[PDB]
């Protein structure tokens, strides 16, 4: 994918993370588990929802009555209507199909971005207090208990507190 995270350096998704789109898995001496990142998940849901609603809502719909009201000696006018009807069908068909292909690309890459952005937020907090393994995981040079893990997830990790233990 465009941002290199989903099915990229983060090779697969997590069945065990049921309560959000993006988040964290931790393991320490106390145990392990998954925590959704609520803020990034909600922003993403709002974003994709807005996209779908725009695709739907921006359509101008108006009353039309489509029949076949020309007779046997009005075939030239009947053909003019055919060319018109077929023309609009060709336009809407192409534009609908391509819109779907193009927007699906954007949506999947949007998720990819969101994961990468979350990854980078953690990376910059931990700096050299943890090893970047290359698979979406960080391996701490210090013990990081449940409260420490939460500080990482909530963006308040205190680097100076652990650097001595880390080095």
């Amino acid at each position: 994918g465009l941002f290199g995270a989903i099915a990229g350096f983060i090779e697969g998704g997590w069945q065990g993370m049921v309560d959000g789109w993006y988040g964290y898995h931790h393991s320490n001496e106390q145990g392990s588990g998954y925590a959704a990142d609520k803020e990034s998940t909600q922003k993403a849901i709002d974003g994709v929802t807005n996209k779908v609603n725009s695709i739907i809502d921006k359509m101008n719909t108006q009353f039309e009555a489509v029949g076949r009201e020309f007779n046997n000696l009005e075939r030239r006018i009947e053909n003019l209507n055919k060319k018109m009807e077929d023309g609009f069908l060709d336009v809407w068909t192409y534009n609908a199909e391509l819109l779907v292909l193009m927007e699906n690309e954007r949506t999947l890459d949007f998720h990819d971005s969101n994961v990468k952005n979350l990854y980078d937020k953690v990376r910059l907090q931990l700096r050299d207090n943890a090893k970047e393994l290359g698979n979406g995981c960080f391996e701490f040079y210090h013990k990081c208990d449940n409260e420490c893990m939460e500080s990482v997830r909530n963006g308040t990790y205190d680097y100076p507190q652990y650097s001595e233990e880390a080095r």
Partner: protein, 324 residues
Amino acid sequence: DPDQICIGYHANNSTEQVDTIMEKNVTVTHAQDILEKKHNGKLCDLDGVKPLILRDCSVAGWLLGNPMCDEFINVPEWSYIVEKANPVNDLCYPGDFNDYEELKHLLSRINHFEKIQIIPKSSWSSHEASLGVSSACPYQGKSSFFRNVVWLIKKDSTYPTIKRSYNNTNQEDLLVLWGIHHPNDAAEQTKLYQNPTTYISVGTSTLNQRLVPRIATRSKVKGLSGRMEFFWTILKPNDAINFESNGNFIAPEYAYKIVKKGDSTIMKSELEYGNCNTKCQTPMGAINSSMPFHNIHPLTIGECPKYVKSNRLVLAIGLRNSPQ
């Protein structure tokens, strides 16, 4: 072992696939189709005014009162007209209807419609008004005719020149219908009407018509080589229509008060009414108009999604999900 924190994303049991511009058949955690493919299989009211459903009759047979048609039940308004593809009851007596397609278009959507008597059948004192019948227009095993017009013939070997007016005293436009009979030859001409050379003149504030019967040797249709040709006008409030004729005149008895506030069209459908309401009707059923696109049928009436040639338009909502 050293402690770890990892960043990751949701997966689930979804096998839903989408296509992207660069990759086909991508499995995702959630998707949404934006193509409407379903219909209710019924003809419905349109917002929510009922259609006029003509069953086995054409618009012409219905208006003229073809006796093989169902009894005239008043429907004072409608949103669209439904005809079967090939109505069995049209002009029982063979012939033509002038500017027929324009009349159908005009009548496709009607705000008020009311049949009224404009020339009583009993008022023809100098002509025969009750012998205007044909085996081609049966009613209850008896020869009959279009019920809303009168086929006048000579009385006691004389057809006096007719001069009749009707003045539209109503507050609404009046649709008026009349006809001319084209006989097979001069012997039939004088047999029915006495006078060998005839005309029908019709004048309003805008109409200036003079019809004359055309003799041709014509093929028998339902055993008849004669023809009826029908005409119509919209008579405005306070205008008068004036008829003059010395033969071949198919006179109005009934006409129709109309109020027009917009148009639609004639739908060809073999379905019956379904006591439902819709915003978008197709000939095979009514559809929702929530989705932006549909693929049901092109001949729609109403506020419809855009018609496309596609079997699916599926948007990704969720993320790439490992497939089965």
